[PDB]
Ligand binder design. Sequence first.
Ligand SMILES: NS(=O)(=O)c1cc2c(cc1Cl)N[C@H]([C@H]1C[C@H]3C=C[C@@H]1C3)NS2(=O)=O
Lengths: 49, 491, 147
Amino acid sequence: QVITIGKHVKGYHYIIANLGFTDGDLLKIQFGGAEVSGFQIVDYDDSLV
Amino acid sequence: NSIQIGGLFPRGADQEYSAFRVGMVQFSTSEFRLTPHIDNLEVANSFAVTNAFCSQFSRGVYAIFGFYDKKSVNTITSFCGTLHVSFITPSFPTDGTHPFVIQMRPDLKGALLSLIEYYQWDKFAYLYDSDRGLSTLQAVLDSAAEKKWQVTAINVGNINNDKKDETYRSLFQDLELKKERRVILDCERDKVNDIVDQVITIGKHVKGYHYIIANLGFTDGDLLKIQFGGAEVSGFQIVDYDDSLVSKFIERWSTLEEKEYPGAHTATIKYTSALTYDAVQVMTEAFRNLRKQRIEISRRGNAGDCLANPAVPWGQGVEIERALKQVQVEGLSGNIKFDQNGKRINYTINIMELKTNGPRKIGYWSEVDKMVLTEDDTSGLEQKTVVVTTILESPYVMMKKNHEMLEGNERYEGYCVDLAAEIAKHCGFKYKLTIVGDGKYGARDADTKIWNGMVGELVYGKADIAIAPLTITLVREEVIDFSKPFMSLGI
Amino acid sequence: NAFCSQFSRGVYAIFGFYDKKSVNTITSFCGTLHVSFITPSFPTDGTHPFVIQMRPDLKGALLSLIEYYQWDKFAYLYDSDRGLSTLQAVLDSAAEKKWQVTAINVGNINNDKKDETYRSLFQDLELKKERRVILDCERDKVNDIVD
Ligand SMILES: NS(=O)(=O)c1cc2c(cc1Cl)N[C@H]([C@H]1C[C@H]3C=C[C@@H]1C3)NS2(=O)=O
């Protein structure tokens, strides 16, 4: 709904309070201009991971 | 009289072919019938066009209907001007006046020039598609030179699919260099629905931008994407849904089965299919008028090779085209008339602007008359120029010597004039400078409390505000109010 | 007619010229029938098979000349008959290098008016007082316009 009403330009800023930050969709607002940060507990770089 | 005709159709124009099948029996059969031999073949290969054309000429039909592409228009004109066979099409208009070609699409270019002059731009960009031709590009550049415009045209059409997510980003970021604000698109609906999606992904549909679609099916594409945006989108329609026969065809079209006619069980329709439906009307009116004048079209023999050296044609087709240019009926686009060549005249195009509730019209444009807006003034909130009363006093409020040549708020000059300009600058409202009638400051009446002068103009709701040399007293706070005092004085 | 006639004659190698209106016809026939065609005419745009063409490209050298003379603002007079490929080409570089380009068609003017129409054209150029002109025509139109 944000991307429909056009509120993801440069200037805005967003914080997701979850654990699966990339577990949701992010290709929508990736190229926007806004800046999005969050949190992960599952780091894909590790060996057993 | 089942008369042999020929039909050319691309492999994918299913809505148009189904609309042709609808219009076939939508009105016919008190008389002559038609023999449509259909060729669901391609349009890019002019060799394929040639093969289909010589096949239908070996059939020996009396008229051929279909589409064409820009890589085939020369082939169609070259064979038709030779063999005198009248050809009718809904496609983009030809450039040169050619004989034996009747073309169903109206012009766009004069309308588009009218629209640009109405919005009064000076500088913009112009994304075009090569595969629809460049006639509009040639047209806009001349008037751009004359009307001192600054045009940044860019080809976009030859971009492949596999890079068609980053090409557009590079393109619009190059448009960000000059900080473009005004775009004209000129594409097919597929390219429109691609480019709007890429714009809405990169976030360029806020308030500030502005867009113009150069097509005929303005609402035939998707508009729920950028409807709530902030940007402003305008276009053009030739199929107006408000009319009686239009809505009759809408109901008749919506009630049909999708399985029998693909792409038919919807609410709206393509303008191409609409012109196909009207083409059946014209094509039947032709043979109707020939049986009115009782002129026999007996071929009286077979046709032969399309490569006949030299081939000799038959001028009853010239009389066919002569009767074709005189047809004047009503249809989905409205009234139709033709020139001496096969181009449409006497048409009308509605200007369609997108709003929050959805699309709406603001005016029409004719073949001869310019843009006539329909005066649709739904602006319910107008900031009223507030009532500012004062009195002439030097140097508070003074006349100017050239007040007759000047107008209104420009006529007055003084300390109060400058002050009122400052107040209106700081508060953002509109105002109009007026004068008290009786020429008094104002006091109350004995026994009736009738405040005259500038007092009763504010007491009795007449005037809105008074920036003027007025003195704060005790007897004036009861009826009106004052700000903090701004200039000291005494008797 | 000529092409079908000579293929009925059983030609092994076809040669000839073409204008802008027959180009699709020739490339369509040659792509189908796989017959080697050779030409000195204007080069095409899409990569088409069985078409060998002697006339070299011009657009890169012309752009290079533009960069060498180091211009920003100029007029460009073109004819349609030879094609519009260079017109499409220079406008992209105009968008990139932020040039001020004025392009005007000349090719439709009939011979009965080619003393005053050109005069009106140059007066409209003098409304901006252009100084840098690229002509793009054939030799006949060049000799007609320089006079
Ligand atoms: N020197 S003068 O008469 O023009 C003049 C007189 C006045 C001025 C400013 C000026 Cl320049 N502002 C004051 C206001 C400012 C603040 C303090 C009192 C009022 C609020 N009122 S005033 O005392 O009427």
